[PDB]
Amino acid sequence: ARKALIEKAKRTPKFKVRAYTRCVRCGRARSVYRFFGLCRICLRELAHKGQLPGVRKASW
Amino acid sequence: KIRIKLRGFDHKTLDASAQKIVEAARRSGAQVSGPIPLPTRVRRFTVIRGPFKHKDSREHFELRTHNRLVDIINPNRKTIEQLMTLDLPTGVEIEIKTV
Amino acid sequence: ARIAGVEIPRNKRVDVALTYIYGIGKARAKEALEKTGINPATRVKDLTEAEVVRLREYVENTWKLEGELRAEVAANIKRLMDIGCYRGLRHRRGLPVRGQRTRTNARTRKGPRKTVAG
Amino acid sequence: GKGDRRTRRGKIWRGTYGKYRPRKK
Amino acid sequence: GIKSFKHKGLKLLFEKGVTSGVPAQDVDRINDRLQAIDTATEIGELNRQIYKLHPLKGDREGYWSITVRANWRITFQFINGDAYILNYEDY
Amino acid sequence: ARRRRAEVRQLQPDLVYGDVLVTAFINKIMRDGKKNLAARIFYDACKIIQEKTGQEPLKVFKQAVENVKPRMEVRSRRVGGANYQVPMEVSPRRQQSLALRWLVQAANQRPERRAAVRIAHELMDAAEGKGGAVKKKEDVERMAEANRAYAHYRW
Amino acid sequence: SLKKGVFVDDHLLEKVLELNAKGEKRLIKTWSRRSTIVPEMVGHTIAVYNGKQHVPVYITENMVGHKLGEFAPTRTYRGHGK
Amino acid sequence: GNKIHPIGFRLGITRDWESRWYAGKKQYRHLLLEDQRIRGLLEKELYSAGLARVDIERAADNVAVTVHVAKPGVVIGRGGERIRVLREELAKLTGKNVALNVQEVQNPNLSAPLVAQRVAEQIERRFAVRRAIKQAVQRVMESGAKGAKVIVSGRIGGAEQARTEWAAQGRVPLHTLRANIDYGFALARTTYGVLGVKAYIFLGEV
Amino acid sequence: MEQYYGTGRRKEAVARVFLRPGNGKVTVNGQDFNEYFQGLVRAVAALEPLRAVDALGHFDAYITVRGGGKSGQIDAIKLGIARALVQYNPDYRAKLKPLGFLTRDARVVERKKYGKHKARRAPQYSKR
RNA sequence: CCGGGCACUCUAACGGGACUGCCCGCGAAAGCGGGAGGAAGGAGGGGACGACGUCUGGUCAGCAUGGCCCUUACGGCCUGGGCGACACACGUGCUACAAUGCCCACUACAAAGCGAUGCCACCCGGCAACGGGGAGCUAAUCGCAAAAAGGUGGGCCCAGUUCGGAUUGGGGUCUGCAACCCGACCCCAUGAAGCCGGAAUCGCUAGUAAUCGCGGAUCAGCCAUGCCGCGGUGAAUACG
């Protein structure tokens, strides 16, 4: 259960509460940020890549 | 009467592109209120540094969204003429409304 | 003054003295003496006998309290005797009623620890 | 009494409002 | 007689024949060992050379360890003709 | 390994008095970082001193501290798995700290009801040489007294 | 705790009501506590699923807000060594 | 070990972005997914070019895409194909201004992604890795570099035992901010597994 | 009526101090320098630089304050009062330095750091 | 609030600002001690940054991937159950045992952030949760929010007590197709254990520990007392 499971995450019918978030780059169901549509893992990868517009290291 | 707003992620491109419009409006017959620095809306998020499960010690990032305002007096088509479609941004979002 | 089934609380504010009855608590307390029209900050020490009579007559009537409602509460649990539900079995086994965590805690219904060891 | 649901202090701690802590004025 | 499991994969292989908890090439191996630990009436029977039997030391005292393959062990407590806490683990 | 000898922290002088000592006492009163309640209690008790005695609290408090000062204390030291207890002298910094600490503690040890009256009374008792803190002070000096044997280990 | 809804399964009720005219047989199953005790057809048995099998629960008044499956424990426990 | 991505470590000062557009919520998510699918689709049928970067810029339905390549040999003169429907096939799920440009990366021996990719090809050619590392470094160092460092890790030359081959000449200060350090990485797919190639290229700054 | 500089800051607190040369030792903002600061013992310490100088009520105080809590505001007022009397009396420098009434005092609340429970307080552990 | 003004405060963009450069003393130098110099100092206070390597460390359940195995099934869909079980054991915590305290009323003073498929002012019903209305806000404009500890006034008077809130009965609300197993609140009634902790064991050196509330992520809702942040008041001690 992983391939047929990233299917349902985009399928989204039948009751509105059965629909859930899901990382697009991966298939992660946990720690999925609504802002990017990505898991915390993928988000970190791309942020170091530079492929995340404006996204920058936080030092203060 | 004409109010223009310029939002942006990069401050250096903003502080420069929203200064072009101060020069391109002043040298066309108008009084221009200079680069008004509206406060920034910092959008932070904190992610666990490892793909595994090391809760302590992570690493966070921020997405600073800058806002800059500029007002010009009379809406004459002399100043309008230049600021009409002579746009030079890198994706910088611009809002133009008069009230 | 033998208000309901009790009499105990002497010199200690009627709004507080009332509390010392199974059925009164705190809300029904001031509610009873504002509806009876008596000063809450009084001595409780057998003050005006009339106020005490009115108080007694109102309180002891109106709503069920003391040994009578203890019987009703116990009977409401006896409801889930028969061939009752799941909530009854939790009253049977002696375990928490509201489905909480019983892996640890739940000592207020289970009682002190027994320790098995192995 | 930070855990008593019948105080302005417990209602703060819980977050929610009510009779023992009205939504101001 | 085997009486209790600690490893779920081991549990399933002996009970239902479910092999998806162990390595695929160690299916026959693990099986013959478990049957031996099941038939064993005393620890002395689990003494064939190919098992490399020995009791563990330290906090694992009271346990035993026959060898499946490589760095892999089946550990258990044998007592009165029965093994308990059948685990499959690193060496 | 204390490369730096840790410089002595200095305080702010109080209101009305100018003490370089009273604020240190108010601090010991302070719990959870509420200097307001702390200072109030002391000044409250100062008002209480005026009643039971016609003395200015600036001396009553001063003398009390002076009476709850440990001349020498016992110190556990070397050889034998730290078996000895050499009676050592007490530095003016430490006499200072112990005096105020024992005062507040003994003050809250009293059976009274209000914090102010405990402070006031314990100060009056200590000014005389009667306080429970004075007990503590005299006790610590007994220990230091009984150890004069291997005191010559000193250091 | 609903108030303006207070619902029962439509499919449970469909099967329950069309088998309620002038009498029936107690042979009636379900798959959802979700419902509610339902007055009428009190003298009935509803085989409720507990996750493993269908337990014949019996209705004899007394029950109401307790839907079904409260009369169908899903666990067993039974004892802890003792 | 544990060291931060020398690209992300810069981002602000030194080494700018790679996808430069601004949007608020309700848009960022959609436009980032599209943006990444462009990078994903390009990488496939453009690897033979060996692309150092895939810069992307936007301005309301404008989507500019700059493809940096050592040798843009796969562009071939206007209507000679390799661009026409190729830069037009992007708008089969976009439909916006697919403005695709091509850049000429002068020296590939100073482009970290290209260096690592050349090395990762050689791993799959069944080359002697340690010698391949040494050469690639000197090759980078031969083309005027101020410092270089290549790293292959795991399963070297097949053989059951994960290793890590290491070579670096000149100066590579990762901790310094004014660094101008190019970082590249590549997956070498082998019949015995997968190994990763890091490549660090350094030039002066101030 | 009049003006005399005013910029006192302490731990996220901003106070603009004026003072108007008049015998009426007055207040500002909400109510009195009392009233607004009543029950607060250390509140009256903000007027200590005036005691350090020869001001037994020679000025009419006017300090608008904002940000932080009372204590920081009070501290900031002290910095502002001093910043005024040092401005229109450049010779009153030789008392603001030995007494040290002139410092912004960079002592501010330190950041919550991850892992730790709060600033520096470590989350406490057992090996077993 | 308007006229008008933008010098103050603030907002955010580049800069200036100490480099023990200056004085005394020590020294061969590096440097150390001390002093006016100023907001600041002898890395000013905190971040980001983690060498060669070590632990056959972690991680095939994020992802990629060699090999083994499964394929009318070790894959796929659904309803229901379960991850929430409880005779027990350990960790991290939250709330307390009270009077430098609790309750009620009044009245002040923050920062950092979030919101027009939402934040929801002001009215109206309601003891309340909340429901009806309904203005403003693409938001330094409108809203979330009154910060809380504090202060003023009053009441309890040291007793398991107006401490403490567990547990349980009853009545309700809101999200949700639906909250029995297992949701959060609200109101009435119950009011348990606990009167400060054995052997042991932890954190913190200055805005720090302690104490107080606030915001955000995930999120229909929420088991968050958690985690990541924000500011309020603000100790003690360091001989060694």
Next chain:
RNA sequence: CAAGGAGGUAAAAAUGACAU
């Protein structure tokens, strides 16, 4: 000023782990 040759010496504290 700078040391060589001489003498009193810690305690109470054991063990070892699972393919080379």
